[PDB]
Amino acid sequence: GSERADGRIVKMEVDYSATVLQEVIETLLSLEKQTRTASDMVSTSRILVAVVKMCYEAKEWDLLNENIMLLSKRRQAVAKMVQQCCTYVDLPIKLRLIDTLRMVTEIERARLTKTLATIKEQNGDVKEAASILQELQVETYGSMEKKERVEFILEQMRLCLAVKDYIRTQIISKKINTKFFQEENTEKLKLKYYNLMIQLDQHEGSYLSICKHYRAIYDTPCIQAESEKWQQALKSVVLYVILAPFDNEQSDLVHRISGDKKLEEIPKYKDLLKLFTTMELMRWSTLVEDYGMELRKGSFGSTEEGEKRWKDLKNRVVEHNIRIMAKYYTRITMKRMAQLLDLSVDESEAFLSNLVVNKTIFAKVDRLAGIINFQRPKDPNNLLNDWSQKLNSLMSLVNKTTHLIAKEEMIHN
Amino acid sequence: EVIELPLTNPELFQRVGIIPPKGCLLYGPPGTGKTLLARAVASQLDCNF
Amino acid sequence: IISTHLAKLYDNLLEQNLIRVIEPFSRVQIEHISSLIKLSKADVERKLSQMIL
Ligand SMILES: Nc1ncnc2c1ncn2[C@@H]1O[C@H](COP(=O)(O)OP(=O)(O)O)[C@@H](O)[C@H]1O
Numbered sequence A: 001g002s003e004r005a006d007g008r009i010v011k012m013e014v015d016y017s018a019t020v021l022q023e024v025i026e027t028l029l030s031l032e033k034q035t036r037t038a039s040d041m042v043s044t045s046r047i048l049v050a051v052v053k054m055c056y057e058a059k060e061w062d063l064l065n066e067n068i069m070l071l072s073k074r075r076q077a078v079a080k081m082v083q084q085c086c087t088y089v090d091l092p093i094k095l096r097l098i099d100t101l102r103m104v105t106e107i108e109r110a111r112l113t114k115t116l117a118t119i120k121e122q123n124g125d126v127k128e129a130a131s132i133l134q135e136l137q138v139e140t141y142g143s144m145e146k147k148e149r150v151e152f153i154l155e156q157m158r159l160c161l162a163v164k165d166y167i168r169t170q171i172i173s174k175k176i177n178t179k180f181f182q183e184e185n186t187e188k189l190k191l192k193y194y195n196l197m198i199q200l201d202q203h204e205g206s207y208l209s210i211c212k213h214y215r216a217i218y219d220t221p222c223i224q225a226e227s228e229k230w231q232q233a234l235k236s237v238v239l240y241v242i243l244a245p246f247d248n249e250q251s252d253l254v255h256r257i258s259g260d261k262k263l264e265e266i267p268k269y270k271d272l273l274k275l276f277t278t279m280e281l282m283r284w285s286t287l288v289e290d291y292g293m294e295l296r297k298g299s300f301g302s303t304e305e306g307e308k309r310w311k312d313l314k315n316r317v318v319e320h321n322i323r324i325m326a327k328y329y330t331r332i333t334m335k336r337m338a339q340l341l342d343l344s345v346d347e348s349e350a351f352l353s354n355l356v357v358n359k360t361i362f363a364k365v366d367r368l369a370g371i372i373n374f375q376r377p378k379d380p381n382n383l384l385n386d387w388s389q390k391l392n393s394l395m396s397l398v399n400k401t402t403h404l405i406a407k408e409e410m411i412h413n
Numbered sequence B: 001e002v003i004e005l006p007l008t009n010p011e012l013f014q015r016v017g018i019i020p021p022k023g024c025l026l027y028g029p030p031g032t033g034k035t036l037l038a039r040a041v042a043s044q045l046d047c048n049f
Numbered sequence C: 001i002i003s004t005h006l007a008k009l010y011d012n013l014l015e016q017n018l019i020r021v022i023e024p025f026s027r028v029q030i031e032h033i034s035s036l037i038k039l040s041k042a043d044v045e046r047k048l049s050q051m052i053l
Helices: A002-019 A026-033 A038-057 A064-073 A077-085 A091-104 A107-121 A126-133 A146-163 A167-174 A178-182 A184-204 A208-218 A221-225 A227-243 A248-259 A268-277 A284-297 A308-328 A335-340 A345-357 A380-411 B035-044 C006-021 C030-037 C041-052
Strands: A331-333 A364-366 A371-373
Touching (some): A002 A026, A002 A038, A026 A038, A064 A077, A077 A091, A077 A107, A126 A146, A167 A184, A178 A184, A208 A221, A208 A227, A227 A248, A227 A268, A227 A308, A248 A268, A268 A284, A308 A335, C030 C041
Antiparallel strands (some): A331 A371
């Protein structure tokens, strides 16, 4: 392999002479094929560097790039590894890169798919470029390193949302492994990941899910620390826990948030969460008045996607009052119930219907301008259970109550 | 390839969509180098032959 | 073949809507079921008869 290096160095001049090469390439290509072995990967290094180098001088590459693919078609794996990684780095770029990916159809191809897809269009053409990156990541899992790997998975994300899609956003999304978030390095990245998952979920009109994400990002040490970081996320956590419909996880999430010491630092939002925790009538108007300004100021937005939240909030309010009335009142009327819920006879009947349809209360109406009835329909058996249960609880009062009486006699006299 | 690799380099086999090999049978004229192969394999590989 | 079938679909649809209009309610004055379902009473109670029966 001395002459492999020596004659290279010799031909280096010899080419560089004619490079100062199109014809001088052949006699070198042949001398590199007559070998095939150890010195053949050193011949691969030096020859594949000079061939690439010939391209750089004048470039004069329209044939080089394709010449190399033909030559590369002629092949010496690790000889080709660099030969392709060296030719990796606008119209001339298109066809050349097409030849690079064309030949590499392994960690080099992906990194030219980043460049190719995003750089080639970087605009409305996203549909055409991003076509490529809807894939290529799939089975390269173990071949890539998670930094780059996950990295352009995230690219797949944002190009897929700007594409205005959802499905592949969904599947291409869930393919992400949180376990990789033990590593602080990847932890810095995942902020992106969640941020998107928010964007998606906003599109889906989910909320509780959003709140779980904002929760998760909010768990980041990096943003735990900085007081100017965690506020605007913490807020959003509130607002969404408020918009989510009353349910299982809503409660314990809300309950947990109310406990968070940091939430004390916020003030109006504090009053909001504390306002949905407690059980009492909301009266919409006062709420809107007090909190409208402070809400709107935060970066509830326009009258489109954001404004759409305004209608939800009203719904959650209705579900709230109608949700508590079911607690206290055993029976209720109509007019007064409208008054309590502000809404007239319609806005009510509708709210109640939707709640009973989807099912969120047991209420049965008596229409003829009269009475909503919220009491469940128990049967002798149900009433008996309460009596049987009462008897049992009393026993413990009669049993527990005994030891105290004795404890005093022994401690007293 | 059938035998050794599908163990230490099968993790990517699925990336082609193909279960590791199943079995391999020598079969040849008495003295073609069969019995000497099982010895060479268990000597080099070493695992649980 | 699929057209004349709509009659079936239409029927199943009307029956449901009704069952949902009287779902949570008692003595619901029938004129209300009407205007909600957006149909003349006469054939509403014409059907509600059929359903009760
Ligand atoms: N390819 C070979 N290289 C070296 N020795 C061989 C070879 N083939 C056969 N032999 C000789 O014969 C023996 C192997 O016989 P073996 O292949 O077991 O026969 P059989 O297939 O009938 O069992 C070895 O010990 C060696 O001495």
